Structures are given as structure tokens and as C-alpha cells.
Symmetry: C6
Subunit: 316 residues, 6 copies
Amino acid sequence: KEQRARDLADERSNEIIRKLTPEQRREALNNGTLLYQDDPYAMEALRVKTGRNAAYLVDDDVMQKIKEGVFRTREEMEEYRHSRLQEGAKVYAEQFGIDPEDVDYQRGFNGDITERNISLYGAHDNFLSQQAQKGAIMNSRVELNGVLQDPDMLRRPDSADFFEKYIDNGLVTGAIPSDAQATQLISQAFSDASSRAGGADFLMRVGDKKVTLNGATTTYRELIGEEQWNALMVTAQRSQFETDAKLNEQYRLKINSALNQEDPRTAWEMLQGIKAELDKVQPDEQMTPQREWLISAQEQVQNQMNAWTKAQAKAL
Amino acid sequence: KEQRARDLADERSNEIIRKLTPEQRREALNNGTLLYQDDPYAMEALRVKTGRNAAYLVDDDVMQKIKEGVFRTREEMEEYRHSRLQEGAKVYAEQFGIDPEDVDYQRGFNGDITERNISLYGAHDNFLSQQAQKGAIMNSRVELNGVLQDPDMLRRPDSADFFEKYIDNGLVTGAIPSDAQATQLISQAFSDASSRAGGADFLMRVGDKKVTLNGATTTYRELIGEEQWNALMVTAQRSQFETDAKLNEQYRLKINSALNQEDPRTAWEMLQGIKAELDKVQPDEQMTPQREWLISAQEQVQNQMNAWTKAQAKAL
Amino acid sequence: KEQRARDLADERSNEIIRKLTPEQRREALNNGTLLYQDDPYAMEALRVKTGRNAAYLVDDDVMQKIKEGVFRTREEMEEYRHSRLQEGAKVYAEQFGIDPEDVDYQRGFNGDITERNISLYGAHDNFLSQQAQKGAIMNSRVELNGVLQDPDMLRRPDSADFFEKYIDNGLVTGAIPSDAQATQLISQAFSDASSRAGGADFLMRVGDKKVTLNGATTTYRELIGEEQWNALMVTAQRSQFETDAKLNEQYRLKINSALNQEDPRTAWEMLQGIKAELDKVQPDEQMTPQREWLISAQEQVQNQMNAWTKAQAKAL
Amino acid sequence: KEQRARDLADERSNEIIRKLTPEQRREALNNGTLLYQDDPYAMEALRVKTGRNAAYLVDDDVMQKIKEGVFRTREEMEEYRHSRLQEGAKVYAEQFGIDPEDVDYQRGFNGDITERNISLYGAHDNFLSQQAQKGAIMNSRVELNGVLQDPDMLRRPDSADFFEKYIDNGLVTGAIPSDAQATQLISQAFSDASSRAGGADFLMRVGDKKVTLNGATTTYRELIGEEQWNALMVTAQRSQFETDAKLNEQYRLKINSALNQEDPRTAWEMLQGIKAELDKVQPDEQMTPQREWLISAQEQVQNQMNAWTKAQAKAL
Amino acid sequence: KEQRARDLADERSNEIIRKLTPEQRREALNNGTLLYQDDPYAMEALRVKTGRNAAYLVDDDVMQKIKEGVFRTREEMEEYRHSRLQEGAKVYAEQFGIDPEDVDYQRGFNGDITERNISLYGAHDNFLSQQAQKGAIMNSRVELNGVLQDPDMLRRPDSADFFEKYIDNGLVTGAIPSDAQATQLISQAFSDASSRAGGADFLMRVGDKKVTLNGATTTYRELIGEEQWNALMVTAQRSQFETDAKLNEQYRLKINSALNQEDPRTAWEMLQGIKAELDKVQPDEQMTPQREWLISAQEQVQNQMNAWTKAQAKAL
Amino acid sequence: KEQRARDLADERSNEIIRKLTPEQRREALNNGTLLYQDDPYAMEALRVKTGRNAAYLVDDDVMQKIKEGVFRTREEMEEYRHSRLQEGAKVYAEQFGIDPEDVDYQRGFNGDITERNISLYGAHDNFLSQQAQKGAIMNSRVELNGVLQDPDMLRRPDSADFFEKYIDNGLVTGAIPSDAQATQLISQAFSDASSRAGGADFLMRVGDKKVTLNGATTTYRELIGEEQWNALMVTAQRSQFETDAKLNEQYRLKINSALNQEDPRTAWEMLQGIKAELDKVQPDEQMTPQREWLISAQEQVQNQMNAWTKAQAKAL
């Protein structure tokens, strides 16, 4: 009848653990006034259950602090796990009035230990891989910003060579492991060099190197779509004029001074000089809001030249 | 044949619990007119089932009030759980006409108690972690707004030092636990200091400190993307002119007064003084809608100077 | 061999229930021409199966009308459940030609009854919690619109006090249970008071009270982000000028009349009076499309004053 | 050893069903050249397996035509199910060279029949509920468009009463069952009456009735947010001027004719008459792109009156 | 002890399959130097396991080429499945050094064959249904573009009749099976006829037919929302002027020529003729960017007529 | 009693593995001071468990480096798997102080090996299929950019033929396997040829070929929607004027020079020549921002001709 006596023990344990709080049970355990203190199987089931509770509490605490990143390395999470296991076993046994040594309590508190450790290791390893991915992305930007932040070092004809060599090495050696993440790294380095001085030269020079990604081998200008390339180039050429306000003032004032000369024939030469100087800070031939400035200036200077030639007949 | 008599008991219990409402059964239990009142196993199965029902009802009530946050601490949820367990056992037993003490009713009402407590503790701990995350985010904004709300204390050269020290400490000690959430905290503090007076100085000064995030160590200007940094700086420099309307009026009226002098030579000096004063409320060199005001003013004053010099020849 | 005879009964039942429609079986049951009418175990399996079918049909009907909200309270869903159980058992037994009393049919139709009731109670309680949430959100707007709809009662200096007291009470007592939903309630009440007359005063006064949310305690202006606060204030100050068209006409016509006086010196006083009156319907100092009206008016009146002073020399 | 002989039968069946196509097996079944034709248990396992295949094929066909809606009612799906069951059993048995009557084939083809019928009924009932929801939404728009499409019947003071009575009845009786869907119905009827002639009157009149939704009772203007109400009213007042181009022409030409009179004093009266007539096609006081037309007209007529009064002094 | 000897065989098999590569095992199988070559149960377990591996490899290959569509019909997928099964069994047995005939290898390679075939048939049938849906959508556009692409056949008064008859037939017969997809077909055919010449007539004529969808029966203008209908009509009337640039030139030049006549009285007649001709290429009364052209033209011609009448007094 | 002695062994193993760290256990294993060193079953359970741990650690490492792509081919992943299995077994056994040969440790470390290999092969094959898809997409762009990048080779009348032949072949042979991905390939090749010089001719010529996709056969202009086709054509015709700024300058300056001649009669001929030349770089008749330039030019030249004809009467 051992199958029945233990079966009734489970019911008595459930009644004990429902009808009382974690406090009243301790107050009544030393007073010998529980509902089934006499039956030993009832107390045994109550102990083996009140341990599986504390095990889940400490595991939930650790898993919850793992989910949102509070453990960076792996050894720190294991250390916190061990310390919390020990301290929590002790403190929950003390709170529930149970001896933290009685074998039955541990059969529940240690019930399924390897599988719970597997679960925690899996979740924390997922988070660690995620932060290592994010850290590679954030790190390979500082390494580039060592020789790509200087607006003078950028436009040298070797910066494209350094960038291509860096992607090639970090893709072959292992510095940039994920071939899928090389796209994010490339796009981030571009958007950086896009909205920074002189970036137009660097982009127009790097747009013809060779980079391997996902089996097929192509050219950078062909990796990202052609329309995406045109938009990126337009942004990289508007950068210098939306980042260094002084240059905007200089070119607008010089366009105005050229447009406002008395003899338009010299205004043509001044506008031509302005465009010749502006081609050296916007090499690629895309249309930017500045070529439109030159368009309006040439429009107005041509109208002025027409008017001045028509009014020159009155000098006859 | 014990395997069959109890098997028929389950069928009779199911017929009893389907063919009647929670009201008619009470009216008919004291009248001795149930469908299988004679068979004891039928009544036993009906009782052990009508308890697993009330258990799920009270558990669903508590879990439903846990899902959407009504319990802030953990002790309050446990207290409500215990009170509802007791009161619900009593009231559902009374409604279904069953004795709230008969052992069979409790074998169902207490059937799987530790696992249901595990489920509730897990859900409520998930919610508690979420609200603690949100509370850390909302709290580390008030602590910053103690020495970053004053538009005069902000532009001092030590505010950047205090901000860097705060992030470093709260990231090393534990005040800001989640390395992943430090990004949200940083972005929120920036967007705060972005659209507030004097914020341009604070941003341009903090953009060169050191902050560690996700293993790699970088500079704040390099943490968020360079184009994101330029957009943030443009917003932080348009802030003062989209928050204190009086300053907008002052600069627009002074630009107009400068532009409308009779001798443009003094208008050049007035516009230069305006730009010199404006550089002290917009330090970084990004292009804002105000440098465009100065551009238009210089354009028009140069046109006026050209016209006045051309009409000066008539004084000969 | 009882394990085999019943095993063949299941196969015969499956063949019966596949090879016939719910109609032909009734026509052939009273004609004694089924495929295995002779074997009693075959008919028993066919009955215990054709009941589990109708049980699922009625349960699917009830669950489907529960999923999309057709039952508001809980007692109404239970009542509909009971009536549909009875009527559906009867009608499906009648359609399938089976006696609605034969014990075997009920062993299938009542097979797993408590678990299906658990499922329905869970789904309907989920929906009931959702509608109670939505109803609290929609209800705490009418209670506010009792003393916040009057454009005159709003701008009194006590409306902010009433709003703060209401949130505090409803957050402590229980009228507004979900601390997470207090954000939705606050944002909704604001957006209401935002786009309504006089709302600027109410917002600028409430932006310095104290509200507790998620453990940390802050000020309303700091709960929602500072840039969000500036946008909300701009909207609340453009409200009065995008809701009462008459006021727009009044201020635009008065600005025009001021700008079009013959002696600009009085136009300065008129514009100053206009701005002084306008500060009382837009207290906070944010930039709105109306301060821009005053900016353009002052620009043009200053140009006119300059022109009139320059042409005053001809009076000498 | 019956546990082993059948165990080897499963392996032989798997080898038979892998090593051959549905065609070669038929060609080789009548030639007596299968791999294990001698063993009867092998053939029995092959038959009981080759039936569970065809069962899944026909079930997948029916479930796939159910998923994307091809069965509107429920009886049509059941009819197609039955016809396909019969025809598919026959045709798949014929293709696989198996007798469509041999009991073993049916033990597999009819293996789990009630559960598969449960699955199909559940999926098809889900789809039927979805289309009934969509049909209620689409139907309660035609019923409204019977007395809300006429641009003359709409602006009568009883249309709001009819709309409120309709929502109240259909929400109490059952014509509009889902309290959650009443929001969609209300918003759809509004957006209809929004962008249609005279809709402004209907909206401004219905915005003060009583509608119950989700326990709490409010007013229509308070059901949808106040800013949403202002946007909806602006759209409903721009409707008439973005739907009947003739009226746009009429008002623009009349504004121009008023603005272009020789004596502005009569132009004031003409513009006042225009605004008085326009208030009857835009009752609520929200700002629309048309009040802005009147604003510009009054601006220009005031400038013209000022100029004409200033030039009247030359008549002295 | 048969339960233990085989139990140790599983462990030895696992050690064999972990401690070696798919290459070393073949090199060591013919050299008689495996770790447990002596024990027959070890080799048997190793064989029954190394088959379940190859089975999963070939199944994963086929399922992976099924997931992303490479098999259009069903017979092609079955053919590829069979060929790959045979060839893969042979080649994997050869690579792993196992006889491709030994019964134990097949007990693993053919282990669960019917269920894997069920899985593949289900996935491929899902994809086939998806492509049949997409193909019906793409096909019922070519059939319409046979009598709806001609800009002259479209505006005939029977095109609406053909479209309504087509939807009705294809919805009753079965050419357009999914009542849910009839919405996509209708919207696609509209958007086609929207941005194409003469489409305005076709839309304004079809907007009053009858189409049944989801139980309820409505009119096309009421199927899609009224505001959606107005937007669609505006697009369909701007189509002709955003697709055939020549017509844009013609109307703009003629508007200019009318506006620039010397006597405005004839300009009124010219503009009236232009509007009368334009009503035949934009029947419905919605406001388009072209009625605005006529509005500006009438505005300017009325101003010119006023000026010319005022200057006519000087002819007295 | 063998069922109990091993049952206690599991509890003792769990206590051992909870109460100690991976370090203390090694220090105490050689000192003979574990908690249950005496019992052999306890040590056996501890060993069989401490192996299932290391197995999961190495499997999680490999699966985590597989999830985010670090293994391109399949043989490389298998090689890394094998090397890590060996090295990890050895190193984890050494760290946990267990003999890396004792049979019990391997019964846990090799516990479920074939299923874990199945899981890894499945995940890595999913990733490999994804990268092969992306590689086909990226590769069939370089192959096209060999004869579609030259702005002169593109506008030849055979480029459309080559493109159609390429899609047809790669869809029949297998170079472009996924019929679903042919849409992505087509759209990408178009968007490439869209925003590149001369692309208008290529698009307007390819828009009438034949391509089969998803059973139904249509024309390219009908594959993508007609409104999508019009938008794509507008973009392809604005490309040349938003990519080669020199051409923008040329046409704007020539339009200005034509508009500014003294005798408008020659300006008509100049504008007509400009439009005739512009039709050869924008063949399709869609409306672009350039036809609007010609519209404004013709508008202004017609106004000028009217003014000059009206002022010609003064020459009489």
C-alpha cells in the first residue's frame, strides 16, 4: 500500500502549503501545531516541495538578471550563480523554518540542477554573443576613426587602399568574423565617411575596389544598390556644406560678389573660377544643392549680360 | 475491477458537471436529487473536479491582475495571493454547495500548487524586472536634471566632467546595471540636454570624453553615429531659438535693423558683431537655420553696398 | 483478447465515420443497414466518437464568440455556455441519429469537460481584463472632462491641483490600478487639454507638480521627455489658433491694421499692445506660428519706419 | 516473439516505401516482384502506411483550400470534405495499386479521423468568424448609406438621432455584436460622412449624443480623442471643397470679384456676405483652408482701403 | 540481461560517432581498428545511427530547396525527392564506409519515412498554394489588360459592364476562388485603370454596379471607403496629366494663350471653352491640380478685365 | 532495491554539483574530501552529469558561432565541430578533475550525439541556404553590370533582348532557381538601370518582352503594377538629370539663352530644338521635372511674344 500512503502525503503537503503563509508555517513548526505534523510522509512531501520552490526563486532571480545584461563575462555569471545558490538555499530554508541540511529539502532544491544550469548557460551565452556582436561593430569604428577622422588624411589616395585591405584582412583572418555583419560594418563606416569633410573623395575612390561577401565577389559600388550609391554620394557631397558653416558663408558670399559685378563678362570668369574651385570639394558628378546655386548664378548673370548688351546699343 | 468502477465514476462526474449550472447543483445537493448521488465514487470525482475548477478561477484572477501591473513589490503580490486563495476556496466551495473542508475537494483545489506558484512568481518577477528597468531609466533622469536643468549651470566646463563621471560610476558600481540600457540612458540625457538652453556647449564639450560600452571603449561622439551626432548638434543649436521666443525676436529685429542702415559700411560691422555674439550661443560649426539668416543678411547688405557704390558715381 | 476486439472496434468506427455523411447515417441507422451494426463494440466506439465531435463543435462556437467580444460580464458567458451545451448536445445527437441519453454518447460528449471549461474561462477572462483596461482608460477621460472641458474652468490656478490630486488618489486607492496604464491616462488627458482652449495655462501650471510612477518619483515635465514637452507645449499653444477661427481672424486683422498705419511710431505701440495681449493666451515662451506673425509685423514696421525717417529729410 | 516479427515488418515496410515510387510499386505489385511480397506482415505494414499517406494528402488539400477562403458556409465545406474523402481514398488506393477495400488500408486511411475533422472544423470556423466580422463591417455601411448618402438628407437635424438610435439598437439587440468592433463601425461611418457633402453639420450634431462602449458611457466627441475630433472636423469641412470642384470655383471667383471692386467699402460688405454664406457650409469653428482664403481677402481689402483713404487726401 | 548489453551498445556507438570524423572511420573500418569493432551490438548501434544521420541530411536538402521555391508542380518535387533519396542513401553509405545494403543501416535511414514524407508534402503544398494564389492575382491582370489597356476601348460605356460580369462570373464559377483575394484583384485592377488614360470614365461608370463580397452585397463605390474612393478618383483624373506629357503642354500653352489676349472678354470665352473641353477628360467633379489651373486663369483674367474696364474710362 | 540505491545516487550527485564550484571540486577530488566520495553510485551519477554539462557547453559554442554566420561552407563547420568536440571533451574533463577516458563521463558527454548533430546540421544548412540566396542575388547583379554599366551599350536595341534571354535561361536552366526570387532580381536590375544614364531607353524597350513567373505568363510592364511602372519610368528619366550635373547645367543654360533672345520668334525655334533634342534622352512620354522646365520656358516666351507684338504697334 506504499503507493497510497505517499499519494495521501502529496495531498496533505499541498493542503499545508496552500493553507499557510511562509511566515505562519515557521511560527507553527516550532510550536508543533501544523495540520499534519504527526504523519512523517506529509512532512517529507512538504519539505521536498518547499525546496523546489526556493530553487525556482533563486533561478528566476539569476535568469532575470541575465536576460537584461548585467553579466558581461562568463566567469562573473557563474560566480554570482554559485554565491546566490548557496546564500539562497540557506536563507529560504531559514525563512520557511526548514533545516538547510535535511536531505529531503535538498532533494527538491537540487531536483533538476544540470538542466537548469544548461538553461542559464544557454541564455547567458546568447546574450554574450549578442554583446560581442555589438562590440565588434562598435570597435571596428574606433579602429577606422584613427585614420579616417582627420579631414586631411581622408582625401589622400591611399585611404581607400587601407579600407579595402582592412576589410579583406578582417574578413580572412577573423577580426570581422560574421560575413553577414560585414555589411553593417561597411555601411556604418560609409555613413561615417559620408557626413564628414572630404568624404566625397574617399567614397569616389573606394567605389572601385574589390570586396568578397557571401560567395560572390563584386565591387563596392555594386554591393549597395546603384540608387543607394547615388544617394550616399549626394549626402557625402552635401556633408562639407552642412557641417562647416564657414565654407557655406564663403561660397555664398563669393557667388553673390561675382553675380553683382558691373560688367557681366568678368562675372562669367568669376563664376567659372568658383565652379573650378568647387569641383575640388565635390569630385563626383552627382547633382547637389550647390551645383544648383551655380546654376541660378549663371542664369542670373546671363540675364544681366543680355540686359547690358541690349542697353549697350544706347551708347551708339 | 477497481480500474473500471472509478472509470465509470469519471463519466458520471462529467455528466453531472455538464448537465447542471453552479446554481441548480446547490439547490439539488441538499434535496438529494443529483443524477448519481447514490454512487460514492461519482460524488468523489465530482468533488475532486469542482475543486480544480475553483483553483483555476482564483489563479486566473491573480495572474490576470499580475499581467497588467497591479502589484509593485513582491510581498504585496504574495499577500494578495494568500488572501485570495483562502477567500476563494471558501466562497467557491460555498457556491458549488460543497463542504470547504471535505478532503476530496482539496485534493483538486490544491492539486498542483507548487507549479502554479512557480508560474505566478515567474510572471510577476518578469513584470517586476520590467518596471525596475523603466524606473531606473526614469530615475536617472531626475538625478541628472538636478545639475543639468539650470541653463546657467549647464554651460560650465565641468558639466561634461560630471556627466562622464556619473556614467562611469553608475556603470562600474551598479547604479546603472544594464550595459545595454546605458545606451537608452545616454540618448535620453542627450535629447534632454539637446532641446534646452545652452545645451550646445554641453554637447560639444562632452563629445570628447571616454565611455566604455560592450567591451570596446570609444568616445561619445563615436558611440552614436557621426551623422546622428551632426543631427543631434543641429537640434541642440536650434533648441535655444525654438524654446525662448524672446531671443528669436531679439536676433531677428537686430538683423533687420542692421540690414536697414543707410550706409552699408556700418551694416557690415553690425552684422559682424551679430555673428560674433551668435557664435557664443552656437559654438559648434554645424549649419543651423540661423547661420542662414546671417547668410541672407550678408547677401542683401552686399547687394545694397554694390548699389550704393554704383550710385555714388552720381555724386561726382 | 479484449485488447484486440476493442482495437478492431476503433477501426470499424473510423470506417463508419469516414464512409458516411451526418445525414446518410441517420437514414441508415433506423433501417439497420450500417456497415457494422452487428458488432456492439463498433457501435459503441462510433457513439463515443460522434460525441467528442459535437462537444468540440459547441465548444468552438462558444470560444469563437468569446474571442471577438460578444460577452461583456462573466455570468452572461456562463449562461450562454450552459444553454448551448444543453441545446447542442440534444440537437447534435438528434441530427446524428443517436439517442441523446445513451451513456456511451455522453462519455464522449462529456469526455474532457473541466479542462474545456478552464480554457473558456481563461480566454474570456483575458478578454474581460482587456475590456476593463480599455474601459478604465475611456472612463477616466469623462471624469476629467467634467472639470476640464470648460475653457474657463481650465485656466484657473486650481485645475492643476485637481489633476495632480486625482492621479495621486486614483494611483493610491485603486481607481487607476495599473501603474503602467497611468502613462496612457496622463498622455491622453494631456493631448485632450493640449488641443483645447486655454490649455496652455493648464499645462504650464501642471508641469511642476509631483507624480509617482514605477518606483521613482519625478515631475510631470520630466516624466515625458523634455523635447516631447516642448512639442506638446507648442501644440497646446497653437490649439487656440487652430480651433476657434474667429480669434485667428481677429489677431490677423489687428496685426494688419497696426502694420498699415501712416505713422509707424504708433504702429510700434499697436504691435506692442498686440504682443502684450497675446502673452495672456500663450504663457509659456515656446515658439509658435504666431510669434512668427509678430516677428514679420515688427520686421515690416521697422522697414516702414526706416523709409519714413529717410523720407522725412525731404520735409527740411 | 510477436513483438519482434512485427518490428521487422515495420523496417521492411519502410524499405519498400523508400526504395520505390508510387508508379513502380503498382507495376511490380501485380508482377509479384516486390522486395518482401512473401512476408504477410511486411505487406500489412506497407498497406497501413500507404493509407496514412493518402489520408494526409486529402486532408492537406482540404485544409489548404480552407485556409485561404474558398468555402463560405459550413455545409459546403463539409460536402466538399466528404466528396474528396471518398474520391481520394478510391483514387489513391488505385494509384498505389492497393485494393480500396482491404481492411488494413483503411486502418491507416481512417487512422485518426475524428481529430482531423476537429482540426478542419476549427480552422474553417476561424475563417468563417473572420468573414462574418468583415461582412458585418461591410454590411452596416450599406445600411447607413441608405439615409446618409443623400447630401440633402444628411444635414437634417434628425440624422444624428437616427445614427445614435442605430448604434444603440444594434449594440443592445445584437445587430452589431462585438463591442470591440463598434469602434471600427463608428470610425468607418464617420470617415464616410467626413469626406462627403454636408457632413460637417452631421458631425457637429452627432458629437453630443450618448454611446456606451466597454462598460463606461461617454459622448461621441469624447470617445475618439479631442485632437482626433478636431482633425476629423477639419477634414469634414474641407470635404465639400475637395469633392465638388464647382463650389471651389464659385467661392474663389466671388472672393476675387469682391476683392477687386473700386471702392473697398463695398468690398467689406461683399466679403462679409461671403463669410456669412460660408458659415452655413462649415458650421463648426475649426480652421480650414477656406477661412484662410477669407483672411487673405480681408488682409488685401484692408490694405486697399488704407491706400485709397491715403490717396483720398489728394481730392482735397 | 538483454536490456543492459544493448544499453552499453548505445554508449559505445555514441563514443564511436563522437571520437571520429566521417573520413577516419572509413579508413579505420577496413583496417579493423575501430574502438569497438569486436562487439557486434556496438557496430549495430553505430550503423542504425549513422543512417538516421544521412536520412536527415537528404531530407534537410530537399526541405531546404522546397522552402524557397524551386519546385513548381508537385510531381517534380516527388521526382527530385525519390532521386535524391536513392543517390543520397548510396553516397552517404559509401562515404561513411557502410554497406548500402546491410539491413541495420536501412532501419535508421528508413526509420520514420512516412512522417517525413508527410512533412515535405505539407511544406511543398503550402508553397504551391502560395504560388497559385500569386499566379491567380498576376493572371487575372493580363486577362483584364486585354480589353482595358487600350485607352480608347476603356472609356466605352460597356467596359464597366465587362468588368462587373468578369468579377461576378469568376466569383461564382471559380476562376477567382478566394473571396478574400477578390479585394486584392479589385484594388489591383482599379490602380491599373487609375493611372492610365481615360481611366476616369471607367471608374466613374463602374462605381455604381453590384458586387458581392463576404456575404453582404454592396456597390463598388461603397466597398472601398468613400475617402479612399475620392483619393482614387483624384489619382485617376491626374493620371492623364502625369502620363502623356504632350497633353500637359497643350493645356498649359492654351491656358496661357487665353490668359494673354488683349481683350479679356474673349479670354472669358476661351477659358470657358477650355473648361468645357477639359470636362470630357475628367468627368467626375473631384478637385484636381488642373481645376486649380483654371481657377488661377479665371482669377487673373478677372483681374485683367477689372483693370481694363477701369482704364477704359480714360477713353472718354 | 536497485531502484532506490540509484535513486539516492541522483540526489547525492545533485547535492555535489550544487554545493561546489568547478574549481573546489578538482581541489577536493584528489584530497579525497568530497561529500559522497565513498558511495560509488554517487560518483558515477556525478560523472555522468558533469559530462552532459560539457557536451552542452561545446554544442552551445558551436551553435552560437553557427547562428550568426562564421562558417561559409559545410565542410568547415564539420571540421570546427570535430576539433572543438575533441578539445572541449579533454579540457572540460581536465578542469572538472575527471578522467577524460572513464566510461561514465563519456556516457554523459556522448549522451545524445546524433540528435545534436542533426540540430547543428539543420541550423547551419538554414544559414547556408540564406547566404546562397543572398549570393545569387548579389551575383546576378555583377553579371548584368558587365553589359549594363556602360551608358552607351545600354541604349542599344539589343540590351532588352539580352536581359530577357538571361532571365529566361536562368529561369529554365537553374542559374536563377527561385521563381519567387526572380522578382527581387528583376526589381534590382531595374532600379539599377533606372538610376543610370540612358536607362530610359532600356526600360521603355524591355517593357514589352515576355517573362514567365508563377505559372501565369505576362509582360514586364504588367508584372510590376502600372502605377509602379509609371513611377519607375519617371525615376529613370530623372536619373540622367540627377546624376550627370554637367547635362543639367547645359540644358538650363540653353533654356535661359533661348528664353532671353530679343525676338521671340527665334526663341520659339530654339525651344523647339531644345525639346526635340531632349526627346532623345527621355523617350517615354511620362511627365518629368524637365518637361516642366520646357513648359515654363514656353509660357514665358509666349508672354514675351505677346508683349512684343503689342509694343510693335508703336512702330506704326
